Structures are given as C-alpha cells and as structure tokens.
C-alpha cells in the first residue's frame, strides 16, 4: 500500500533513530537507557524510565 | 595477388594433379604450396570435389584438411 516491504521495513528504523534522539536531545539530562519496546495499533503506549521522570 | 594466392591461371593442370604423393594439405597449407591461397583456397575442392581423388575428411570453419583418398 504505496510503501514496499523490502526497501521500507528499514523505514521503521527511523523510529529507532528520530525517536531515540527526540526523547533526549533537548532532554540530554533525562537519564534514558532503553524503554521496554512496545507498540499497539492506532496508538503507541508510552512509559518513562530514566533519571528525571519527575522534574519535567 | 602477387605470389600464388588467387588463381595462377596458366597452370590449370596443377589443380588436376592436386596430391603429388603429398598427403598433408589443407586450406591452411595451400597458400605457400605455390598454388591457390586463402582467398581462393577452395577452388581445388570446387574443381575436383564430388567423385574422384578428393574426399572430405575435415570439418572446421574456413579451414579444411583434404587428402588423396585410399
């Protein structure tokens, strides 16, 4: 459906790349270490687990 | 040509005596046999071909051995 399989199953890998800076680029003082990797359809479950889950 | 390649026209009996007890001869030989050369090397196998002295014992492209048949 307008997005192929072989050439864009690596396209989800930007959501290991765009995302794993987006958590900690303004927030480099946060303390991120790799959350329990998780997904549901239509929406993504979000849990924080870091040094600074309190001040921000 | 200059020296025994094309016809050598006066010597038309030489094609008619093509093996002078001389077994090994091909297209690859006739050029310096003082006879027809690789231009017109086949006109000894055009002239005496079908039933006579000459019978085909070779195959390969452009180059064909021939022999006084036993």
């Amino acid at each position: 459906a307008l997005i192929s399989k072989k050439r864009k199953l690596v396209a989800d890998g930007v959501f290991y790349a765009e995302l794993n800076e987006f958590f900690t680029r303004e927030l480099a003082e946060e303390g991120y270490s790799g959350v329990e990797v998780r997904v549901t359809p239509t929406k993504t479950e979000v849990i924080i687990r870091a040094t600074r889950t309190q001040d921000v | 040509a200059q020296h025994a390649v094309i016809l050598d026209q006066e010597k038309y009996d030489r094609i008619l005596k093509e093996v002078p007890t001389y077994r090994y001869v091909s297209v690859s030989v006739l050029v310096d046999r003082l006879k027809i050369g690789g231009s017109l090397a086949r006109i000894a196998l055009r002239h005496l071909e079908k039933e006579g002295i000459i019978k085909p014992i070779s195959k390969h492209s452009k180059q064909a051995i021939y022999t006084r048949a036993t």
């Binding site: - | 690859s28 390969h60 180059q63």
Partner: protein, 206 residues
C-alpha cells in the same frame, strides 16, 4: 544388441565399444601398448580421459600436479598473448582436431601419444639459475619426478606456435606435425631449441 523403447531412438555403430569395456566410444583407443622408457609411471591412460574436462583439483599441492592427466597436459598448454586468454573450450575440439591429423599420420592411440614425445625431443634434465654470481653459470640440475612433464610439454607447444601468427597457419592446424616431431623429429618445430641453448651449459661445465 539391446535397443530400447522410447521416442528418441539410438544409433548402432558406437557404444558397443563402450558397454563392453570402460574405454573409448568410436575410435580404437583400445588395447595398444606403451613404449615406456625412463619417466616410469607417467601414464594416466587406463583409466584415461576422452576429452580434457575431467573434474578434480590438481595444482596447489604440487605433488599431485602429476596426477593431472598426462593426455590433458598438451591440451593445457597452448593459448597466450592477448588473443586467446580464456576461451580454453577451444582446446576441447583441438583434442579430436589433433586426433584428426594424427589419424592420417601415425595414429598411435593415447598409450603412445605422450610417452613418445619427451624421450628423444625434450629434456631428461633441467638447467635452473642458482648460478653463484656475476655471470650466472646455471646448475644443470637434472630430472626430478616432476621435471619430465611441465616445461617439457607446456613450452614446446608455445615456441612451436611462433609461425602460427602473422600469416596463414592456424594454432589448431600447426599441431599437424609437432607431436610427431616431438615423437620423432629433426626440428621442423621447436624440439631442439630447449636442448640447444640450455645444454651448452649442461654438457661438461658441471
């Protein structure tokens, strides 16, 4: 004798020379015997090749380049110099194309084709350069169990091609009278020239 029911029928004159004993199909490469001088045990005939495409590793362990078949060695040894590098499947028709000219001239089927060449036209020797210094007088270091075959075959098929270019003479048809002139020849080919210049060192200087 024993045809078969099918839709692709079979000729008659050939494979009864094959179904009886494990030898050649139409030509009599059969029970003729060897003229074995020195170089004892260099016959890969029985069990031979028919053409030279036998599968098997042969070259990195140098003690078993002698079990590369002795009939294949003259086929191994022709085509150089920017013209025929690759195209070694031209050397598979050469086999029957020099088992073409050998048929008009001294058949001597392959128990006699290669065993007659190294005797009276090639080395029984080598003359390699470990030559002391200044002007290298070469040690005339004679026959090894691998020095009867390699340069004795794979350079005499090369120096005898030197009239197969710039004019008419074909590589497949230069081989008309060089094997026989390696069998018995007075150098209408390249027989003497690898025992001419290397033997003036080798006779009495050692």
């Amino acid at each position: 004798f024993t045809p078969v029911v099918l839709a692709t029928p079979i000729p008659e004159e050939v494979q009864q020379a094959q179904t009886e004993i494990k030898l050649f199909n139409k030509w009599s490469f059969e029970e003729v015997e060897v003229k074995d001088a020195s170089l004892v045990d260099y016959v890969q005939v029985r069990q031979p090749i028919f053409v030279a495409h036998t599968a098997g590793r042969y070259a990195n362990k140098r003690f078993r380049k002698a079990q590369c078949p002795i009939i294949e060695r003259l086929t191994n040894s022709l085509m150089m110099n920017g013209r025929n590098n690759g195209k070694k499947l031209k050397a598979v028709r050469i086999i029957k194309h020099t088992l073409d000219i050998i048929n008009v001239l001294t058949d001597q089927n392959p128990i006699q084709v290669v065993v007659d060449a190294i005797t009276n036209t090639g080395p029984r020797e080598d003359t390699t350069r470990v030559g002391g210094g200044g002007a290298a007088r070469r040690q005339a270091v004679d026959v090894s169990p691998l020095r009867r075959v390699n340069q004795a075959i794979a350079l005499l098929t090369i120096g005898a091609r030197e009239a197969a270019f710039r004019n008419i003479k074909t590589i497949a048809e230069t081989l008309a009278e060089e094997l026989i002139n390696a069998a018995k020849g007075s150098s209408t080919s390249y027989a003497i020239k690898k025992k001419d210049e290397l033997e003036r060192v080798a006779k009495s200087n050692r």
